[PDB]
C-alpha cells in the first residue's frame, strides 16, 4: 500500500465525480447557447460555479502526493495535470487586482472599422481608421498591461517557472521518457530554423503583392521599401486575403465555385451532413451516431429563438456529440461542416482514455485534423465525384495560380506575423526588452521580419500589440504557427499511403483505408504519450518540419521567380512615410 | 411458469442488491423467450439455447439487475472489471444464459436517475455468486478511518447517472442471468415435451 496505490484509488473517483459534473455544466451551457434567456443564463452559471469549486478542491487534495514516488507514466501525467496550482498561489489582493485588470481590459476592448479597412480603397480613410482605433484603445490599455506582465510574472516565478513565456512553453514540454525529450527552450530553436526556411517565398510573394499594390495605390509605396501597415486589408494585417482583389494574375477567368449547382439540386443542411459522413466513411473512420442527428441543430430556429451562430462542435461526455451552425446551402458551409465534423471525430476517436487526457497531443492538433479535411475536400476531383461540378472540367494552369495565391494570401502571409508576435512578447516577459523601449522595439521587429512600417510615429505612450483581441484577452499566440505546419506535415504523409501521382495540392485522400488507419492510429492515443511519438505515429520525424509547405507552394514559388525578374526582392528598413 | 415477474416486472434492482428468484415446479417454454427481437444480447454459454425447450434442470434460479451498457461484456466467465470483481462474478465453469435490452425509455429520467448504484471499491474480490450490502466506509491507506470520511476515506457505493440523451455505451440496460443447477434430486423445470 504505497503511494501508487492511493494514486489511483483518487483518480478514479475523481473521475466519476468530474464526469458526472462535467456532463451537467456541458448541458446547462448548451441548452443557454440553443436559447437565449436569463434563465438559462443563471443555469449556466450555478453549473460552472460548481464545477470550478470541485476542481479547486480536488487539486487542493491532488497536491498531497509528492508525485517521486510514483513510476507509472499515466497517473503521473495526470496527477500533474492535477497539481497545477495556477493563480491561487497568490494572495488575496493581489489576486483580486490581477482579475479586475483582465475583466477591464476585455470590457474596454470589446466596448470601442472591419469594413472600412476590408472594402475601402481610400489612403486617408484607412490611415484614420487606423490611428483612431490605436489612439483610443492603446493609450488606454498600456498602464493595466504594464501591471500584468509584472503580476503574471510573480505568478509564474512562484510556480517554478523562470517566466510567463515559459508557463505558455510548458505545453510542449516532454521529460521522463527516453529519445522523445523536449525541453522549454528548444522551441525558440525549432520556430526560429524553420522561419529562416520559409523566408524567401515569403520575400517573393510580399515583392508581388508590393508591386500590385503600387498599381492600386500610386505615389504612396517605394519600389525597394516597405509596405504600410494600413494597405493590408486588415486592422492588423494578420492575413492578406481582402488583398485577393488587387493581386489577382489573371481576372478574367472565374474561380470555382458550386453554390449555384447547390441550388439547382435542391441542397440542405442535411444533404451537407451525409456528404460530409460518407467521405469520412470511405476514409476509413466509424460511421456517426443518432444522438448526433437527434440532438443537434443544423439550421437556424427563426425569429422566436435567439441563438448564437458560431460554427462549434461540441463533446458533452457520456458519449454526446453535437454540431451548432447555422447551415446556409453555400460552399463555405459545404468547407466548415467538413472541418466540424474532422472536430467530431477526432473528439471521438480518444473516449475510451481517462478523464484528465481526453484532449489533443499539444495545443495544435484539432485545428490541423479539421484543416486537413477539409483541404481534401476542397479539391476538383471530389468537387466532380460528389455530383456538385459538370464531369468535364479540364483544368488550366492559371486557375491553379489563382487558387495557391488565394491559399498562400492566408497561409504563408500569417506565419511571420504570429512569429514576430510571439517573440515580442517572449522577450517583454523576459524582461529582456525595458517599458521604455516597448513600443520602438516592436516596430524595429516589424521592418526586420514581417516588413511593415508605420504610418504615423508612435510615442511611448502608445501600445499596439495590446489592440490584438489575443494579447488583450489574456490568449497564447503560437498555437496559430505550429498547427500551420503539422497540417501540410500530415498531409504529404497521408497522400503517399494514398498512392498519390501528382502534386501535392490536387490530394484527395478519398477511398484509401490505409490513410485512414495511419491516421487513426495517432487519433486514438489523446495525450496519454508524448506530442513526439504521436507525430512519427504519422509522419516517421520526431520534429516539426517545413519542407511538405514548400512542396506544396513550389508551383507558386516558380510562378513568383518567373514573374519577378523586373522587380526587386527585399525590402529596407530606413524607408519612411512620416 | 414465472418469467412474466421476472421479465416484464416494474422495478429492477441496483446491481450491487441483485434479485435472486428459485423458479420451481412449472413448465417452461424457453421459445417464447428466444424467438423475441427485443433483446439486445442473448448468449448461452453451457447448453446451446435451441435445446432449452428439450432439458429438465432441478433448482433455476433467475438473478436481475441493472448496469451500463458496455458493462454487458463483463457478465461472462473469466471476465475482469469492477462489475465483475466488486458486484457481480460468474464462476468460469457456468452453466446458464445471459440476456440483457436496453431500458432507455423506462430508467431514464431528463434530470437523471441516481437510483441505481454501483460498489467501487472494495478489499479483495467476491468469489462467485456472492453478494454484499454493506456500506462501511473504505481505508485507502494506513489511517483510522473512525466512522465519517475525511482525508483518505471513500464511501465504496456510487450511482449510475441516467439521462435520455446520453450514448448508447451510458444508457440503461436490464440483465437477467439464468443458472441452471443439475443435481441427482427429482427435476422441477422441463420443458414441454
Ligand atoms: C428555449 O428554446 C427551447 C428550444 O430550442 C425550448 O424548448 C425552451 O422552452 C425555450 N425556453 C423557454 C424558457 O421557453
Ligand atoms: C500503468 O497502469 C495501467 C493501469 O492498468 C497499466 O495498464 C499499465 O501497464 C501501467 N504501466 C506500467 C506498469 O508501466
Ligand atoms: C501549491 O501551493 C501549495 C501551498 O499554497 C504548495 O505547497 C504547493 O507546492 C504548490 N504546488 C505547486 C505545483 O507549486
Ligand atoms: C453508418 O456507417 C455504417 C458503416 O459504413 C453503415 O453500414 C451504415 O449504413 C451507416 N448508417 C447510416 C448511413 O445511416
Ligand atoms: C470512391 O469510391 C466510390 C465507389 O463507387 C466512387 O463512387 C467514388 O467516385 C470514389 N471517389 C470519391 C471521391 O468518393
Ligand atoms: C499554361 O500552359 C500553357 C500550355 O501548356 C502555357 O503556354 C502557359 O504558359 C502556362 N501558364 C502558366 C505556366 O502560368
Ligand atoms: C412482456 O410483454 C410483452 C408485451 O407486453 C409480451 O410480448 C412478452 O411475451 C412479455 N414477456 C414475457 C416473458 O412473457
Ligand atoms: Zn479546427
Redesign the interface.
Known sequence: ?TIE??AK??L??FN?EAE?LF?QSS?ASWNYNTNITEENVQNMNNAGDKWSAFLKEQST?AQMYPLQEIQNLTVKLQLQALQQNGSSVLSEDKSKRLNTILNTMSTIYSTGLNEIMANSLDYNERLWAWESWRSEVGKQLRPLYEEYVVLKNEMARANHYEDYGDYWRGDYEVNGVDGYDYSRGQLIEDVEHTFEEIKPLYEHLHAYVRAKLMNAYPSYISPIGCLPAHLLGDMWGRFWTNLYSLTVPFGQKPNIDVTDAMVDQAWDAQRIFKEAEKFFVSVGLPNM?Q?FWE?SMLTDPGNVQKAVCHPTAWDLG???FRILMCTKVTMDDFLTAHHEMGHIQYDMAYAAQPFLLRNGANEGFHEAVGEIMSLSAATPKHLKSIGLLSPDFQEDNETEINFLLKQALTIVGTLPFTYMLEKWRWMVFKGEIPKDQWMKKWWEMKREIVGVVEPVPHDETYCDPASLFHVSNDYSFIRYYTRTLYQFQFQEALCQAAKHEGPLHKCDISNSTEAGQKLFNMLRLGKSEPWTLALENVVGAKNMNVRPLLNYFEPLFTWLKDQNKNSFVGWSTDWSPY | CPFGEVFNATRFASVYAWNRKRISNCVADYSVLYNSTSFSTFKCYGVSPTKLNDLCFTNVYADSFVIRGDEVRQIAPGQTGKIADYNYKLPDDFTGCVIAWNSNNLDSKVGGNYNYLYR??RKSNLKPFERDISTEIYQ???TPCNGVEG??C?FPL?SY?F?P??????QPYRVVVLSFELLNAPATVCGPK
Open positions: 500500500s496505490e492511493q484509488t483518487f478514479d473517483k466519476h458526472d456532463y448541458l487534495l451516431t444522438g440532438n457520456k458519449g454526446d | 467501487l471499491f485507502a491507506g494506513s482525508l483518505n471513500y456510487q447517472g439521462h440523451t446520453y450514448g448508447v455505451g451510458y
